[PDB]
mmCIF file of C-alpha atoms and ligand atoms in Angstrom:
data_model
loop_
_atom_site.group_PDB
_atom_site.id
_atom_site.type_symbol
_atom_site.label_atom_id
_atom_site.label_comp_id
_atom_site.label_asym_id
_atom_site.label_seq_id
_atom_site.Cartn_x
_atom_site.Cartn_y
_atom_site.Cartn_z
ATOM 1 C CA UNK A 1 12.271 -32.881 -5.706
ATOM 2 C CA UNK A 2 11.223 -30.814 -8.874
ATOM 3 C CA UNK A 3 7.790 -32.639 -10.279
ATOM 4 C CA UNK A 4 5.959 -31.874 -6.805
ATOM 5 C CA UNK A 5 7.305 -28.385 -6.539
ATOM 6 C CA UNK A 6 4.535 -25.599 -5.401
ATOM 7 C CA UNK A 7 3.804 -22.490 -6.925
ATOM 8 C CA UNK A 8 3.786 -19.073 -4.179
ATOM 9 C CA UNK A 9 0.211 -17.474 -4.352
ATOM 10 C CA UNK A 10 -1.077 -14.414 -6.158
ATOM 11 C CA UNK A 11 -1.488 -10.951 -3.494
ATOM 12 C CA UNK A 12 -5.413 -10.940 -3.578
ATOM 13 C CA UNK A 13 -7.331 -7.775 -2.960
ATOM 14 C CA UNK A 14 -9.417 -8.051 0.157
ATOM 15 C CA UNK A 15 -11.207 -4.943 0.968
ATOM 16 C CA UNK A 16 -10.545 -1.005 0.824
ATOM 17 C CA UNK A 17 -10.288 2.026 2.817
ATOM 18 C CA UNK A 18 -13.295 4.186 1.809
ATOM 19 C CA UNK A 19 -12.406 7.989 1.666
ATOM 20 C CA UNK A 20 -15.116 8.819 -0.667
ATOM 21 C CA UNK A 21 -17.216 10.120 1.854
ATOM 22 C CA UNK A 22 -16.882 12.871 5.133
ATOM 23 C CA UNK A 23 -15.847 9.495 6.779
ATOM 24 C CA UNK A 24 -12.898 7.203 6.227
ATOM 25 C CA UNK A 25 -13.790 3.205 7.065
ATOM 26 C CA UNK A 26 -12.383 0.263 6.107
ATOM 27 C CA UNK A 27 -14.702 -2.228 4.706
ATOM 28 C CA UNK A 28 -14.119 -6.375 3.862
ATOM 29 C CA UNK A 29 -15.067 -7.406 0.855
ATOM 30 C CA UNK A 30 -13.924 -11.197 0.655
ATOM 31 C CA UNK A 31 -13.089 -13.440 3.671
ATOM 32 C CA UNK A 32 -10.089 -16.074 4.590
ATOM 33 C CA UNK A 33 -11.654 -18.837 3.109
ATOM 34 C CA UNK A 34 -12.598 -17.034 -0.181
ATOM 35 C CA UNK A 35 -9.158 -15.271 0.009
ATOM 36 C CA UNK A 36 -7.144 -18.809 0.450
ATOM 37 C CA UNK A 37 -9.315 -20.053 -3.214
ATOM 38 C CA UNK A 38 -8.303 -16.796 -4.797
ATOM 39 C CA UNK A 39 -4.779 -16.890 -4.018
ATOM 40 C CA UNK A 40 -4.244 -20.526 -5.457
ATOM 41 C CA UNK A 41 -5.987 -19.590 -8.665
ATOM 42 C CA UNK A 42 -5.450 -15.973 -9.084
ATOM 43 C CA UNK A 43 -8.725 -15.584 -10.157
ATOM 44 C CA UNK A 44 -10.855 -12.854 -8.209
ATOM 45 C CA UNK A 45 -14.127 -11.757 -10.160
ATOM 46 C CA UNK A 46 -15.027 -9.210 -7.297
ATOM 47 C CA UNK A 47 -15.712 -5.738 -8.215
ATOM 48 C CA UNK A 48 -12.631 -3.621 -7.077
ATOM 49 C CA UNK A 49 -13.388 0.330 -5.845
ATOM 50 C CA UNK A 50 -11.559 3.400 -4.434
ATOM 51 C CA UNK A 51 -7.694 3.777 -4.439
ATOM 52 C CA UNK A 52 -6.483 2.478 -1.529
ATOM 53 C CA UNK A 53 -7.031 -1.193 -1.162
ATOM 54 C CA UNK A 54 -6.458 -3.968 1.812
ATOM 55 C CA UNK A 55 -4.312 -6.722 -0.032
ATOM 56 C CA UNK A 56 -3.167 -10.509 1.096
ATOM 57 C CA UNK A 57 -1.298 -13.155 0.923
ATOM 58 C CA UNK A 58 -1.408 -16.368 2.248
ATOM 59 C CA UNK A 59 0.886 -15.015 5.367
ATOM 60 C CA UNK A 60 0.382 -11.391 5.444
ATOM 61 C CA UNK A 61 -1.815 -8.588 5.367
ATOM 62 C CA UNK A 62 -1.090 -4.819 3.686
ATOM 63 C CA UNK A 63 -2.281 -2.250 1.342
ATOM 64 C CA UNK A 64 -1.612 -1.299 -1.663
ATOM 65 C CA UNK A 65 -2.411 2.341 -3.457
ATOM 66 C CA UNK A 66 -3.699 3.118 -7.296
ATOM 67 C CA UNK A 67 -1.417 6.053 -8.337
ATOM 68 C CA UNK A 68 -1.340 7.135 -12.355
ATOM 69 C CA UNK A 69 -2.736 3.742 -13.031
ATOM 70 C CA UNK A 70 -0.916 1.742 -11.242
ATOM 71 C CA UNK A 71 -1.571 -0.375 -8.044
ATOM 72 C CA UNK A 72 1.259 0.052 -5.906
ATOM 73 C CA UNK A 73 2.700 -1.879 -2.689
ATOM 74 C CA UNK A 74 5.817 -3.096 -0.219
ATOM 75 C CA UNK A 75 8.276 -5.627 -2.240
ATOM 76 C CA UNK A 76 8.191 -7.331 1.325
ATOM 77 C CA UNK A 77 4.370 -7.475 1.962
ATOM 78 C CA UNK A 78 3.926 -8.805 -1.840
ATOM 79 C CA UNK A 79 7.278 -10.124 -3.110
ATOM 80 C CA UNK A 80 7.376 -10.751 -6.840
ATOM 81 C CA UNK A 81 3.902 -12.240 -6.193
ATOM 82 C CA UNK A 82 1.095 -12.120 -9.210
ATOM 83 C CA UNK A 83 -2.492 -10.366 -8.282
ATOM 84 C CA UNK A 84 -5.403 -11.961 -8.365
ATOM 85 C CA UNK A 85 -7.235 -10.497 -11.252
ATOM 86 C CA UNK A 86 -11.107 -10.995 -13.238
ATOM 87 C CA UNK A 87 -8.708 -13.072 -15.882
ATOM 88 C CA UNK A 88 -6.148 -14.971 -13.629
ATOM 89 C CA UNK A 89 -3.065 -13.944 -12.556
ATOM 90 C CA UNK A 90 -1.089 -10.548 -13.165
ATOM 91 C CA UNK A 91 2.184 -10.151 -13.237
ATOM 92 C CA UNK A 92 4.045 -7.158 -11.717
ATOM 93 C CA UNK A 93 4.369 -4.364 -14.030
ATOM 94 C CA UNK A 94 7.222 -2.758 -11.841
ATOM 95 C CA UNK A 95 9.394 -4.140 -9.547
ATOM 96 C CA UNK A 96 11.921 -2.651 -7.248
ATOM 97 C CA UNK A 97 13.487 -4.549 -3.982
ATOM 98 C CA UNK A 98 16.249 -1.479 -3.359
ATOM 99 C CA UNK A 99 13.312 1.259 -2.959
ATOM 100 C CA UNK A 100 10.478 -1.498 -1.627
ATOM 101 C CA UNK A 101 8.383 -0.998 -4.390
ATOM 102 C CA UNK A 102 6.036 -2.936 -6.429
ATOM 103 C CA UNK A 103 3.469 -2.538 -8.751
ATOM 104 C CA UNK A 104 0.605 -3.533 -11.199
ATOM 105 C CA UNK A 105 -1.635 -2.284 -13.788
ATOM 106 C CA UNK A 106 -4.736 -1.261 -11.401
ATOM 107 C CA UNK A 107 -7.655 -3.192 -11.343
ATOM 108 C CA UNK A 108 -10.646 -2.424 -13.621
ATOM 109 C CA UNK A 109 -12.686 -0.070 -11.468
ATOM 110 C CA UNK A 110 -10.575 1.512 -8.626
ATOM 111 C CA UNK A 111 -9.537 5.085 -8.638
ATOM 112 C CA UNK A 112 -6.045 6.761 -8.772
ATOM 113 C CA UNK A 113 -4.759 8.952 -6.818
ATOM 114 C CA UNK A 114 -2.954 11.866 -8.853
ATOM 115 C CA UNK A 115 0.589 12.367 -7.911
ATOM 116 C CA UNK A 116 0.896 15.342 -5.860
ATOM 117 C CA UNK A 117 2.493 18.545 -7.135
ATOM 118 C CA UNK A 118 1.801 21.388 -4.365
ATOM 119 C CA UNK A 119 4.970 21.206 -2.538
ATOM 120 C CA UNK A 120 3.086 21.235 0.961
ATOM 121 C CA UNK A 121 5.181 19.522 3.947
ATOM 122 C CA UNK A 122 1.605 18.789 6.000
ATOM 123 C CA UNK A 123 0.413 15.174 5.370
ATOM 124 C CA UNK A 124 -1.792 12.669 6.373
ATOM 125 C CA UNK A 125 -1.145 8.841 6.531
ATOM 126 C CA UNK A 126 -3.668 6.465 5.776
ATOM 127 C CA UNK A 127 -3.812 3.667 8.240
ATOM 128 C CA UNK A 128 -5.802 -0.220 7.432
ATOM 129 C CA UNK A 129 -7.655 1.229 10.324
ATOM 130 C CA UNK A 130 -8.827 3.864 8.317
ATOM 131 C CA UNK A 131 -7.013 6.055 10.550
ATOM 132 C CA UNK A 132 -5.868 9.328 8.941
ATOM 133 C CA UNK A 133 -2.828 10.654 10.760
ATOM 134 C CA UNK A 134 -1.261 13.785 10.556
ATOM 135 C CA UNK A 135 2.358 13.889 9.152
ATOM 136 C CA UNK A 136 4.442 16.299 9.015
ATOM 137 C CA UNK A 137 7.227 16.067 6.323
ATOM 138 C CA UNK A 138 10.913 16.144 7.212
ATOM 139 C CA UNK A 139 12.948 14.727 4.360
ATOM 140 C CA UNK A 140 12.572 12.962 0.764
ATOM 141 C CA UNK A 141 10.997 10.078 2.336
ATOM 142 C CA UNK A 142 10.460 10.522 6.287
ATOM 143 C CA UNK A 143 7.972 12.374 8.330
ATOM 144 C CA UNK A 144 6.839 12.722 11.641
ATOM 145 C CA UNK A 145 3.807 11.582 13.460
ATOM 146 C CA UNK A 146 1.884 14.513 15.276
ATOM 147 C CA UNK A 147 0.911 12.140 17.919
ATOM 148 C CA UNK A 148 3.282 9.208 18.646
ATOM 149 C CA UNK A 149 2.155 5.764 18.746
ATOM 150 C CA UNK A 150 2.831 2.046 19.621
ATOM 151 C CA UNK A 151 4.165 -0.037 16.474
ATOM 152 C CA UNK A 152 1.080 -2.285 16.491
ATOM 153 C CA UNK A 153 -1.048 0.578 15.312
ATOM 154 C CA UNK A 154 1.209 0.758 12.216
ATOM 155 C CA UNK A 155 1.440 -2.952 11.169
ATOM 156 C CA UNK A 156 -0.290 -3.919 8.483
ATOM 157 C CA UNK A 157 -0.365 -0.030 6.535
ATOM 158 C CA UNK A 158 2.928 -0.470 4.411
ATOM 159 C CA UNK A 159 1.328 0.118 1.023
ATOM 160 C CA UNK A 160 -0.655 2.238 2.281
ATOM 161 C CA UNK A 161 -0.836 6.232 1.159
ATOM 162 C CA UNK A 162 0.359 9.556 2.640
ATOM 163 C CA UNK A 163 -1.488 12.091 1.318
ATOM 164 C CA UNK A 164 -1.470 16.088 0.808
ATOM 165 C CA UNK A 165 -4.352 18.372 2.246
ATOM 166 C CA UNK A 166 -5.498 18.578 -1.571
ATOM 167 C CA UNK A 167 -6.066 14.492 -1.348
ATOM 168 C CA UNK A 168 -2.631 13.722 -3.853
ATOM 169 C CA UNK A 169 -0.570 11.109 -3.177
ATOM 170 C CA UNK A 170 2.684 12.301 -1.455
ATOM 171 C CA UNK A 171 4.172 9.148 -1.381
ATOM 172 C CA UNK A 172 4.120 5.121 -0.559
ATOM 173 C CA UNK A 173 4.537 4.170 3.590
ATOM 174 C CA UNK A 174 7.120 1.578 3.695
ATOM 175 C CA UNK A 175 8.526 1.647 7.569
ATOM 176 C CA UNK A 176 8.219 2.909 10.543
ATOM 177 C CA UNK A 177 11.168 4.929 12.785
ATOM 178 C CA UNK A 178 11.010 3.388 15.978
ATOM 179 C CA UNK A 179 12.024 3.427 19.854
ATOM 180 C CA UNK A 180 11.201 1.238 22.295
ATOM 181 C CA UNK A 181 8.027 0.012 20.408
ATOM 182 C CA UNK A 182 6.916 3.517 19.629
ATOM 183 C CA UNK A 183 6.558 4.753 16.586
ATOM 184 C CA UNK A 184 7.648 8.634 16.210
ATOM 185 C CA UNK A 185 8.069 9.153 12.463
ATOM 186 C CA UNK A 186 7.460 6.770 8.952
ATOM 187 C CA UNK A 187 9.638 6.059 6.446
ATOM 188 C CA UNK A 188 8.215 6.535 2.962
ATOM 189 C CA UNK A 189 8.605 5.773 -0.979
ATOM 190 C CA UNK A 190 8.281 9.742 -2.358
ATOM 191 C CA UNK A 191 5.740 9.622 -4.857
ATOM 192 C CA UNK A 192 8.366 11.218 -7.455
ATOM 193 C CA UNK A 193 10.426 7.990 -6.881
ATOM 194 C CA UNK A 194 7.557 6.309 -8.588
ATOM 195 C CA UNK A 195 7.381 8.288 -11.172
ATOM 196 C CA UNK A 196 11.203 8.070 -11.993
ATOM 197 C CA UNK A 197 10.393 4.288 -11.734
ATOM 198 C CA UNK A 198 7.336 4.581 -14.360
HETATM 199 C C1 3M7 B 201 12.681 -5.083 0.534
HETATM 200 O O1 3M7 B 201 13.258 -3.970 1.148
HETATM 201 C C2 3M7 B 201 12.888 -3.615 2.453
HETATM 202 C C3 3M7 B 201 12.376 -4.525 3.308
HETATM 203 N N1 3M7 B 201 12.018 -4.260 4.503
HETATM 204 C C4 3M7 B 201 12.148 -3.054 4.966
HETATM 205 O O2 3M7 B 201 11.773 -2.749 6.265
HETATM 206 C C5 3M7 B 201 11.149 -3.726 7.016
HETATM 207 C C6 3M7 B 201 9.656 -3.810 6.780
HETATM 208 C C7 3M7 B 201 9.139 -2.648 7.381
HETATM 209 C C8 3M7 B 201 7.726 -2.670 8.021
HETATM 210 O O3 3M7 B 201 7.405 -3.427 8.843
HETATM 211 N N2 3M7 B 201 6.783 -1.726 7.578
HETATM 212 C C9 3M7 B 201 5.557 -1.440 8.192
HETATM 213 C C10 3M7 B 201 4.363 -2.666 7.852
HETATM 214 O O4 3M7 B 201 3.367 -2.422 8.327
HETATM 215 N N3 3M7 B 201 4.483 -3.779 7.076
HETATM 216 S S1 3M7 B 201 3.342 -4.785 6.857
HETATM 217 O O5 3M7 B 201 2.288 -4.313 6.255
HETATM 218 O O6 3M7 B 201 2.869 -4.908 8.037
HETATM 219 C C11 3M7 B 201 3.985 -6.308 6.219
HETATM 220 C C12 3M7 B 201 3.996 -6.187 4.716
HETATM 221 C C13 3M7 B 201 3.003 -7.051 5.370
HETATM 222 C C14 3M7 B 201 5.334 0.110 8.049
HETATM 223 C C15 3M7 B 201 5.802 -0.453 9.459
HETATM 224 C C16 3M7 B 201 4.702 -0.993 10.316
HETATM 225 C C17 3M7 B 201 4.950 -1.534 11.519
HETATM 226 C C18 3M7 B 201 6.279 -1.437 12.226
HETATM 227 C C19 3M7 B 201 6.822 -2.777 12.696
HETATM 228 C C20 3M7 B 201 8.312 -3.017 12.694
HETATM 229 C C21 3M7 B 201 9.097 -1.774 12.448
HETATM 230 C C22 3M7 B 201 10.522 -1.890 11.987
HETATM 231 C C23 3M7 B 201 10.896 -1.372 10.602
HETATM 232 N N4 3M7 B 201 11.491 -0.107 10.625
HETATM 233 C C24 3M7 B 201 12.775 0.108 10.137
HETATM 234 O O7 3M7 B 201 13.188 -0.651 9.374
HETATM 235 O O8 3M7 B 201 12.973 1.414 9.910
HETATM 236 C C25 3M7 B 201 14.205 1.961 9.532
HETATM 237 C C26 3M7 B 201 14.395 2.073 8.033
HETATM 238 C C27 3M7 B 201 14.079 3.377 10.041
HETATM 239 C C28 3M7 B 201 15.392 1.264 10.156
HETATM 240 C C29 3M7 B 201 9.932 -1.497 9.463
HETATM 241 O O9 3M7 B 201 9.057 -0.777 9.420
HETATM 242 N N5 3M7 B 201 10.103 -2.480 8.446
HETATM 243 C C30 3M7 B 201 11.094 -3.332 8.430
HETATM 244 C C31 3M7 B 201 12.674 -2.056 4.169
HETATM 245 C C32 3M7 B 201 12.805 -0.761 4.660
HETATM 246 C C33 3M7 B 201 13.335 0.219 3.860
HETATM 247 CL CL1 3M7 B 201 13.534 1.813 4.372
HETATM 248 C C34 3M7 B 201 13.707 -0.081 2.578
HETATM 249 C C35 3M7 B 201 13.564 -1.328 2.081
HETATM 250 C C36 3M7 B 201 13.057 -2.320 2.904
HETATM 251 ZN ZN1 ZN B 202 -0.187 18.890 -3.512
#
């Protein structure tokens, strides 16, 4: 019935993938319990850093990448979800189901990346692992993984960034080309494909 109906979370920022250093780790910054809270009421007063960030919902766990201002994810990690924000909830700024694509106005104190412009096919995927995997580019939005590996390695990094050897964001991971459980290659949101969307 429509008086008790219930109202679908906010995507709430959970920790980040440092690269600010020599060495890429991944580090927590609010738990399940405090994550649950923050979802309900959108309201996260955290302090948010870096570019890349570990995101959740209720059901799910992703990333999501500050590019030109913008905090960027997978429609089907967040949805048309709100983020959790200092001030309650956010809507999306952008939203795109047909290319995957969502995104909001990024959180008072993270970084951007700047949208990459060098033209270089050699990338590097950044994993919730804090993995950084080299990619090489074949196409618009795929590229190949130097080293193969199992699916379950992958799960969870949609949102997550590929990036050029200068550190620009190349583009958006959004799948992963698979056989047999294995992983070869990734499927990607170009980083000019959010820019057409901006
Ligand atoms: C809303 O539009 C949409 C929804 N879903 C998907 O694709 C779904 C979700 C991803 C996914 O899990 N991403 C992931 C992910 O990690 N998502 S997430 O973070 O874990 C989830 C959001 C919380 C990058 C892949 C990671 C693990 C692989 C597990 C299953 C792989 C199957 C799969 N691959 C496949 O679809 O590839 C094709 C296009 C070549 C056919 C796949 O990766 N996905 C299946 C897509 C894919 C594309 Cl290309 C475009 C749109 C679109
Ligand atoms: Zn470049």
């Amino acid at each position: 019935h429509m008086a008790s109906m219930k109202k679908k979370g906010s995507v709430v920022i959970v920790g980040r993938i440092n690269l600010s250093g020599d060495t890429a780790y991944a580090q927590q910054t609010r738990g399940e319990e405090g994550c649950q809270e923050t979802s309900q009421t959108g309201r996260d007063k955290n302090q948010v850093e870096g570019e890349v960030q570990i995101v959740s919902t209720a059901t799910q766990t992703f990333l999501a990448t500050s590019i030109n201002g913008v905090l960027w994810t997978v429609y089907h990690g967040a949805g048309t979800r709100t983020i959790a924000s200092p001030k309650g909830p956010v809507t999306q700024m952008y939203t795109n189901v047909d290319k995957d694509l969502v995104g909001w106005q990024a959180p008072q104190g993270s970084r951007s990346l700047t949208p990459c412009t060098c033209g270089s096919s050699d990338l590097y995927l950044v994993t919730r692992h804090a993995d950084v995997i080299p990619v090489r580019r074949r196409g618009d939005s795929r590229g190949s993984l130097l080293s193969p590996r199992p699916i379950s390695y992958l799960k969870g990094s949609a949102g997550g960034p590929l990036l050029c050897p200068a550190g620009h964001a190349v583009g958006i991971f959004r799948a992963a080309v698979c056989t047999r459980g294995v992983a070869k290659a990734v499927d990607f949101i170009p980083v000019e494909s959010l820019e057409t969307t901006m």
